[PDB]
Structure formats: C-alpha cells, structure tokens
Design a protein around this ligand. Structure first.
Ligand SMILES: [Zn+2]
Ligand SMILES: [Zn+2]
Ligand SMILES: [Zn+2]
Length: 846
DNA sequence: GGTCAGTACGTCCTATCGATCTTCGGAAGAGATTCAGAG
RNA sequence: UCCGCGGCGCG
DNA sequence: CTCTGAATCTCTTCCGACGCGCCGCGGGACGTACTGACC
C-alpha cells in the first residue's frame, strides 16, 4: 500500500522524505489551508459576526473558510487522500501544528480511522522511525486551546478597533497581548524620560611594586565614607590629597572561584543569546532556527524545556570523552531544572547530530551556520566541567582614603573552551602577587566624570525576557508579539532598541483607563495559564471563552458611552503660539496613526469655519554611539531639553529649516512646548537607504526609463545598482575583467570575466554576436590571478582539483547566494564541492 | 534515495526624463466658453 | 516562413 | 443686473486610388541551479 504524509513546508517534505522512503508519499501543505475570513467578500451585530466569523453569543460557531489560492492545494490533497489508504498528519509539535492537522482532517473527510498524528521533535532517521512506529491520535484538546486563543484575539481586535477609530483615530488596531507589550514599552519609556541623571566623579591610581610590577586601582572611600565627589573642584582636591598621601597595601585576599556553564537553549534564551552575540533580531533568529530545524540539524525551535534525552546526553558525553578528555567530562551529567509549568515532555534546542560541525552545513546560509554554531557550542558546554579561576583582591590605604583592585586568573577552562567570552571583562586581568601588608610606589592618577544611568531601553531580547518573566506570551508567540507591536505603529525599533511612539502612549493610557481588567499583567498571565489548563484538559474552552467574553462585553459597553458618562476620552489638543498659514490662528500639536503633527483649531469648526491646513513634522532620531558603550543611552538622555512645567524630558521635532520644536514627554497630558531657532538641515528624504560599496556614502532609490534603480548621493560617485525581482537591492556587481589569453571555441572571440547575481562567468567580448558563455575553472583563475579584482582573489585560492584528481569549476549556489567550487567527471558532477567558510575553504562530498 | 524533467532566475545593460524618429489638410463630432435675449 | 521598415522603379 | 440657451470656438479623431517588380535592414535566446514526481 501507499500512505500519505502531509507536512507544512516543502523543505520539511524533502527532509522527511530523506527518511520515509518509497513506500510513503509526502505532500507539502503550504501554511494554513483553512482560516477565518479576512476580506469583506440589530443588523449591526450580524455584520460584526459575519466579519469576525465567530458568533460568541451563539456558542462560538466558527464559519471557517479557505483563503484564495489554497483551493488547488485542497483539491490535490483530496485526490491524493482518495488514492491513499492511511493519511499521516506530520505537522510540528506545538498547538499550531495540531490546529493545522485538525483543519486538514476536517477538509479531507473519513475521520474515524483514516488519520494518524505523527509527533517528532527532530527530523532524523531514528526519530522519524520511532514516530512512525506508533503514531498517535489527533489531540482535540490542544486544537481547542489554539482555537480559543484565535477567537479571543479576533474578538478583541474587531470589537476594539471600531471603538478606537471613533474615539482616538482611524487606522488603529488592538490586541490582547500586543496591548500589554506596548504597555510594558511605554512604562519603560516613562521611567526613562522621568529620570534626571545625577553626576559623580571617580579616581583611578597607578602603582608600581617594589618588584617593579605595575598595578591599577580605583579609589572607593574617603574618611571611611564612600568616595563620590560631586563637582570637578572637589575631584581636584581629592586628587591632590591622594597625591600628598602615602600608599600601602593593607589588605590582601585570595579565593578560588568556579563558573558553571549555561543551560541549553530554550527559545527565549536562544533569542537573547543571538541578539547579544551575533546581533540577530528575533525575526531573523526564528527564521533561521526554523530553517535549521526543517533541514534536520536542530531540534524543534519552540520550547520552554531544558530537558535532554538520554540519547543526546550519551552522545554529547561521548563527544567530550573522545575529543577533550576526562578532565572535562565530568563524573555525572549536568542537570538543569526548568519551570514546573514548562512543557517538560519536550527537549531543549540541541543539534540532531553532535559530530556535524557548523562549517559542514553546505545548504545553509552564513547566518544559519553561525546560529547552528551557537546552538552546538551551548549544547557541548552544558555538559562540561566547570571552569576554575583564582581571584585576588587588594586594598590600599592612604590617609583618609582607601582604594581597591580586583582580578582573576584562569587555571582550568573546561566550559569556557568551547564557549569563549566575547570580550575580556574588567576583572579579566593579572594583578601582581603583592605581599600581605606590602608597600607601593605611585604614578600619576586620573580623574573621571560619570552620570548615573537611566533604566536600560528594551531590546528585542530584553523585552522577550521580560515577557517570559511575567508569564505574558508563550514560546510560540514571542516572535509574533515582537513583530506585531512594530507593524501596528505603536512602537518602533531603532539602534536595536525599543522606542515608544506617542500614539502608543495615547492608546495605552486609554486602554488602561477603560479596560483595566484586560491590560493587567496578572490577568493576562491568568488567561495564558487557563489556556494551558485547557491544553492539559483541565478546563473547558467554551467556558473560559464565555467568561472572558462576558467581562469584555461589560467593559466595552461601559466604555462606549460618552466621556461625561465615563467613556474613553478623546485625543485632547495642546495649543501653541504658531501662525496657521491659512488663517494665522494658533496651532495645536496632535497625534494621528501617521505620527505627530501640527494642526489648526479650525478642524474642530463646522464646514463654514473649518480649517484643514496641517504642518507635517519630522522627529529627530537619537543616534546612539556604539563606542560610548553604556554611556550611549545616558548621553542621549542628557541631550534632551527638559519641560518647564515638569521635569519630564522633551522630544524634538523639526518644523522649518530655521525652526525646531520641543514637545514634552507627557504630551498631551502636559502642555509644555518650546520653539527654537537655528540653522537646521531638514532630512528631506524617505524610502530605501543603501550604502555605496565604492565610497561608503548613502545610496537612494530613483526611477527612470528602465524602471527602478539605486544611485549614490555623492556627486563625485555615480555608482548605480539595480532592483531585482525578489530582493532589496542587487549585490555589488564588480567591474568586468577582460582576458585576451582565453580564446573562444565556437568563435574567434576572446573571453571576459563578468560578475552578477547569477555569479561569476566568462563571456565572449562580442557578446551580442558571439553569445558564448561558460563557467571558469579554478586553474583558469589561478592562471590570471593578478587581473582579478581584490574581492574575487579568494576564488583563486580554492583547491583546483578534487581528491579524485578531476578538474574543478566555479559555481553559484542561489539558495545560499555564494560561490563554491565543484568537480565534474564525464560532464556529470562528481559530487565533491568546496565552500568558503570564514577565510578557509572546506571541502566535502555534496 | 536517487535520477530526470520541468521550472525559475539571471545576463546582455542601462538611470535621466533629453532620444528621437519629431511638425498636413479638410471635414465632422463633442465639449467648453462667450454673447444676446428675456426675465 | 511571417511581420515590419526604408529606398527605388513601372503601369 | 443676472441667468439660460444658442451660437461660436477649440480640441480630438478619421480618411487619404489600384496593381506589380527589385534591393537593403531589423525582429529574445541561452545557460545554470533548484524543486518535485516517479521508480
Ligand atoms: Zn488654520
Ligand atoms: Zn511637561
Ligand atoms: Zn557612492
């Protein structure tokens, strides 16, 4: 017989075909085939329930639908199911996969015994074999939980968005967890803008040992009180007093220290680590993680369990025993404890085969290889022996002052070998072995000025960590929350940090005022826990949906009323002394979904006296300096003015090339505004921004007779790139290089080397006439290595012949957008290829 | 799983509107604007 | 085999 | 002094003989990699 396996991604289809075989047929059902309506294709209540699809009053009838373009796939799947005998639903582990499987089952038919739900955490031979050995039944409870979540989201969105349109502004949106995330960001922004940085100085001293060794220490006490000078004069006086005094090392301290490795990656930890080390965002991290999982190299990327299988434990222990040695084993496995509410049935994010190094991933892009290296290193480290340091602490007294120094020396690098630190820390230095009660000689000292840091702005990783802490969201939803808070125009991300737009503040204030139950963190956490209980078959989904809908309806009917009755307050106006170009009247500051702008009061007047003239603003972007490190945020807060009526800082906008505007942070609650005059270069540009590889200047998008292209703004540089079908911009095509020594074979012309998105190729010099092209050989490139531009020279370094001695050719991998070298025999590929991974060429069988 | 056939994307190549060839006469119809008559 | 353009010629 | 209708002006579109012969020139095509289906 023939059994049908339905999977979601075509890549998953290929990888699972890599282990199922000829007996089975695998079909890729791209995405969700059945979903609630999206487009438009007591009558108000009927219209609302038709728009939502769900009818909460009538026991939550669903009215699912098949989106356009899915009909062909539905027909193909139905035909294959008629052909097949047993249908296998092999979607992913999470609730989303169960929902997809339930949708497929409902579409195809013949429910009772024709379907088997396959559960595998990694696409590998053993895992697939065990998964297909005893297939499981479709878990209806998890499907119900997913549907409950979707219904809650749709109800809130389609029942709040009209309210926000009526009261605040058209074009708004709302979401149950999206609103809570925006609230977190807005609260952090308010804490930051309320912060008034203090100032404090510090003193560093240089000393030389009687043995001649050097030491650097930091002064920490004065008069047995903490040393924290406020003003420069006090700092100079302290420095003078320190110089006058005599120094002696009155305290010596030593202590062994141990550092244990980190736990294996759960999804939140993986995102944090990717952001901190490789700089990836959450979207890129999860996309590459999904690619790695589908290709079969890593386990499922949506998890909250640090548990590891016995097979994985034995594999990694064997790898450590074979490669590193017994000093790194250690005697017993390293256990890590996850949350009691976590999906302990799942594993962590680990490699599917420890011996596959990151360089060997031929079919994964460079970023994917880096992510896999991170996962592999974490997995190896999690079972290695703790690293050992010895720490030295020195305290030196001089007059009324005391100064301190601390350092550590590493002696065993068991877990730090595979997972090295990004940079050396302040304590990663060598303090000389001074004696107890020793003496020191002095060198010139250095003062320093600092300002107390404000609370750190949310990074994507940090926001995800906060959400994990509060219980808001789940592993399968973090990326959705992060993407949706940005797409909906309430919060932007710049400098790899979260910034709150004013519209976000307005919507957050209104939602807190009217829907206090929905926006509370504890209630959101309780709702998530209730969904989890439903998944565990601890509660009935319709019951909790009804409870939430009852509370939400009460709150909504309360909120829809007039502001005097207690409804949602409108977008109040802050008036300022500016002349309206149409009627010279004073102009207010308003916020729409587009941004923050200047309007005229005439907008509030009837058409007889109405004024629609508006002034568009351009906010000033904060440019944090990466070199300033931790200071980058602090200096930013120091750059802003301060509102006169309150200590809250103010945000800057430009109104004229001569005039700039400052708006209070609590606008429109606080009406403080300021106007400044000066020479201001208006940005005057919008749209794509590219960096010119020829001069490093900004490159902009332009349109002409040939469509759309990209040209550099530098008047001295006319470099132009082009837009292609499925990319932001074409790669930096290099200048063609002629080769008179390579003759054509079908004609009398000579070959010329050209570059492009297709790759690097050889073409006839009379291209419109000869039209003869062939790929270059590595030996051919080595023959004319000198003429090759600086970039392409690496191709000449690639191995010229395979282990079988056959000749190699330069090819372009479009799936990874990179050049490799492959050998061919008798015109067929020998299956040997070498790629360029981090400055070296790695070769292997294809 | 491996192989073959089919399908998809790139190269030639742009980037200022500037290349480019460019400019009738007569009659009819539709739309827009102006003048005269009536109110 | 098709289309197009240009030029020239005859009745 | 104003409004409406009719008349006039402006702009756009359509048509312009038939038949035959000769010469010249031009006109998207080819290559490589990746994915799916069948065996
Ligand atoms: Zn106005
Ligand atoms: Zn203020
Ligand atoms: Zn440039």
């Amino acid at each position: 017989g023939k059994a049908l396996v339905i999977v979601e991604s075509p890549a998953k289809a290929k990888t699972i075909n890599k282990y199922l075989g000829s007996d089975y047929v695998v079909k890729s059902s791209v995405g969700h085939i059945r979903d609630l309506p999206t487009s438009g294709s007591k009558d108000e209540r009927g219209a609302l329930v038709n728009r939502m699809g769900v009818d909460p009053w009538h026991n939550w009838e669903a009215h699912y639908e098949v989106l356009p373009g899915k009909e062909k796939v539905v027909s193909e799947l139905k035909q294959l199911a008629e052909k097949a005998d047993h249908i296998y639903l092999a979607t992913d582990l999470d609730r989303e996969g169960e929902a997809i499987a339930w949708h497929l089952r409902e579409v195809i038919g013949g429910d009772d015994a024709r379907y088997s739900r396959v559960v595998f955490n990694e696409i590998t031979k053993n895992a697939i074999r065990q998964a297909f050995n005893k297939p499981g039944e479709l878990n209806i409870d998890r499907v119900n939980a997913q549907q409950a979540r979707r219904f809650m989201d749709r109800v809130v969105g389609y029942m709040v968005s009209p309210l926000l349109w009526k009261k605040i502004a058209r074009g708004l949106s709302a979401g149950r967890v999206q609103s809570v995330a925006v609230r977190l960001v807005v609260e952090r922004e308010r804490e930051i803008k309320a912060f008034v940085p203090e100032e404090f100085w510090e003193v560093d001293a240089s000393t030389t040992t009687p043995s001649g060794e050097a030491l650097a220490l930091q002064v920490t006490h004065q008069n047995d009180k903490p040393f924290r000078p406020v003003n420069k004069e006090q700092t100079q006086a302290a420095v003078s007093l320190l110089e006058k005094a005599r120094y002696s090392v009155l305290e010596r301290e030593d202590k062994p220290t141990t550092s244990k490795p980190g736990a294996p990656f759960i999804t939140s930890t993986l995102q944090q680590a990717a952001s901190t080390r490789l700089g990836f965002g959450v979207k890129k991290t999860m996309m590459m993680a999904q690619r790695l999982y589908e290709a079969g190299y890593i386990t499922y990327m949506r998890t909250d369990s640090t548990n590891l299988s016995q097979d994985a434990v034995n594999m990694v222990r064997g790898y450590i025993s074979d490669n590193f040695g017994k000093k790194y084993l250690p005697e017993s496995p390293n256990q890590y404890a996850s949350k009691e509410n976590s999906q302990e049935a799942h594993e962590a994010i680990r490699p599917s085969d420890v011996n596959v190094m990151a360089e060997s991933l031929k079919d994964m892009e460079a970023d994917a290889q880096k992510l896999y290296q991170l996962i592999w290193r974490q997995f190896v480290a999690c079972q290695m022996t703790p690293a050992k340091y010895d720490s030295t602490t020195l305290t030196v007294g001089a007059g009324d002052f005391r100064l301190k120094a601390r350092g550590r020396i590493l002696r065993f690098d068991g877990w730090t070998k595979v997972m090295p630190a990004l940079r050396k820390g302040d304590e990663d230095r060598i303090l000389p072995a001074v004696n107890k009660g020793d003496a020191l000689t002095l060198v010139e000292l250095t003062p320093a000025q600092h300002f107390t840091k404000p609370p750190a702005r949310f990074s994507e990783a940090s926001l995800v960590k906060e959400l994990e802490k509060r219980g808001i969201g789940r592993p399968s939803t973090y990326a959705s929350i992060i993407s949706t808070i940005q797409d909906r125009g309430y919060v932007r991300v710049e400098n790899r940090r979260f910034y709150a737009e004013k519209m976000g503040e307005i919507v957050t204030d209104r939602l807190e005022e009217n829907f206090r139950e929905l926006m509370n963190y504890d209630f959101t956490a309780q709702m998530e826990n209730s969904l989890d209980q439903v998944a565990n078959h601890e509660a009935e989904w319709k019951a909790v949906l009804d409870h939430f809908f009852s509370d939400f309806t009460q709150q909504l009917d309360k909120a829809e009323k007039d502001p005097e009755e207690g409804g949602m307050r409108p977008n109040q106006m802050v008036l300022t002394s500016i002349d309206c170009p149409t009627c010279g009247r004073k102009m207010g500051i308003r916020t729409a979904s587009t941004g923050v702008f200047l309007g005229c009061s005439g907008y509030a007047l009837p058409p007889k006296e109405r004024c629609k003239t508006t002034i568009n603003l351009v906010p000033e972007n904060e440019v944090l300096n990466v070199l300033e490190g931790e200071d980058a945020e602090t200096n930013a807060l120091r750059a802003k003015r301060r509102c006169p009526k309150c200590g809250t800082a103010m945000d800057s906008y430009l109104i004229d090339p001569k005039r700039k505007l400052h708006v209070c942070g609590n606008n429109p609650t606080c009406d403080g505004y300021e106007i400044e005059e000066g020479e201001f270069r208006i940005k005057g540009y919008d749209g794509p921004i590219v960096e010119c590889e020829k001069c490093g200047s900004e490159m902009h998008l332009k349109m002409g007779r040939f469509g759309k292209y990209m040209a550099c703004t530098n008047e001295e540089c006319k470099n132009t790139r082009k837009i292609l079908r499925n990319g932001e911009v074409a790669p930096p095509k290099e200048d063609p290089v002629p080769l008179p020594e390579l003759p054509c074979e079908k004609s009398d012309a000579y070959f010329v080397l050209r570059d492009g998105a297709a790759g690097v190729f050889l073409a006839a010099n009379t291209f419109p006439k000869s039209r003869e092209t062939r790929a270059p050989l590595v030996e051919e490139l080595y023959r004319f290595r000198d003429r090759l531009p600086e970039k392409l020279r690496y191709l000449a370094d690639a191995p010229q012949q395979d282990p079988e001695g056959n000749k190699t050719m330069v090819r372009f991998s479009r799936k990874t957008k990179q050049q490799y070298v492959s050998s061919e025999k008798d015109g067929k590929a020998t299956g040997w290829s070498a790629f360029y991974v981090d400055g070296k060429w790695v070769e292997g069988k294809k």
